[PDB]
C-alpha cells in the first residue's frame, strides 16, 4: 500500500512530508520504500516553477480499512502557470 511519486513537468515539482494536522503544517521529510514509493499519509507539497513557499496539494490516501492507496487532492486546485 503506497503511492508513486507524482509526475511533474516544466510548470511544477513536488516535495514530500508526513502529514501532521491541517493543510499548513509541514512534517518530517517523507521516506521512500524499497520500490521508491511513498507510504500512506505522505503530504505532497508543490512548487510552481514560474514563481512562494510551496503549497500542500495531495495526500497518499488509504481507504478506511483497505489496502488500496492513491493520491487524493485538496479542492479546487488550479494548474501552475507556464514558465
Amino acid at each position: 500500500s503506497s503511492c508513486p511519486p507524482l509526475p511533474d513537468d516544466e510548470t511544477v515539482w513536488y516535495e514530500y512530508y508526513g502529514y501532521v494536522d491541517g493543510r499548513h503544517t509541514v512534517g518530517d521529510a517523507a521516506i521512500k520504500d524499497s520500490l521508491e514509493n511513498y507510504p500512506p499519509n505522505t503530504h505532497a507539497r508543490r512548487h510552481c516553477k514560474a514563481l512562494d513557499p510551496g503549497e500542500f496539494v495531495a495526500i497518499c490516501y488509504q481507504r478506511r480499512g483497505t489496502s488500496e492507496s492513491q493520491w487524493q487532492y485538496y479542492p479546487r486546485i488550479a494548474s501552475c502557470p507556464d514558465p
Binding site: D21, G22, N41, I59, R63, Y73, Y74, P75
Partner: protein, 110 residues
C-alpha cells in the same frame, strides 16, 4: 486523530436529477477536504428555470445556506427539504468517504 475525508466536490453544477427517490451526483471530482473536521454536503435546488446540485466539503460547526448540518454524523446523505420561497431546496451532510455521491431523497431508501 481526525484525518480529512473524501467528498465529491464539484461545487454547483446543473443537474438532471428530478422526480427520483435517489440520484448519483454525476460529479467526476473527488477531493480530500482541506480541514479534518469538514464533512460532505449535497444541495439540490430547483426553480422555474434550472435544477442544480452542489457538492462540497463544509465544517458542520458553521451553517451552510442558512441551515445547520444536524445530520453531519450520518454515514449516508439523506436529503431533507427546507422551505424556501421561489425554489424547492433539499440538503444533506454526511461523514463517510464520497457519501455525497449517493443522494437519497426517499426515506424508503434509508
Amino acid at each position: 486523530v481526525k484525518f480529512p475525508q473524501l467528498c465529491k466536490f464539484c461545487d454547483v453544477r446543473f443537474s438532471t436529477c428530478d422526480n427520483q427517490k435517489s440520484c448519483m451526483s454525476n460529479c467526476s471530482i473527488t477531493s480530500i477536504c482541506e480541514k479534518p473536521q469538514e464533512v460532505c454536503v449535497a444541495v439540490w435546488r430547483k426553480n422555474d428555470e434550472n435544477i442544480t446540485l452542489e457538492t462540497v466539503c463544509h465544517d458542520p460547526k458553521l451553517p451552510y445556506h442558512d441551515f445547520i448540518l444536524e445530520d453531519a454524523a450520518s454515514p449516508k446523505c439523506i436529503m431533507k427539504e427546507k422551505k424556501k420561497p421561489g425554489e424547492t431546496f433539499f440538503m444533506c451532510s454526511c461523514s463517510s468517504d464520497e457519501c455525497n455521491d449517493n443522494i437519497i431523497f426517499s426515506e424508503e431508501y434509508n
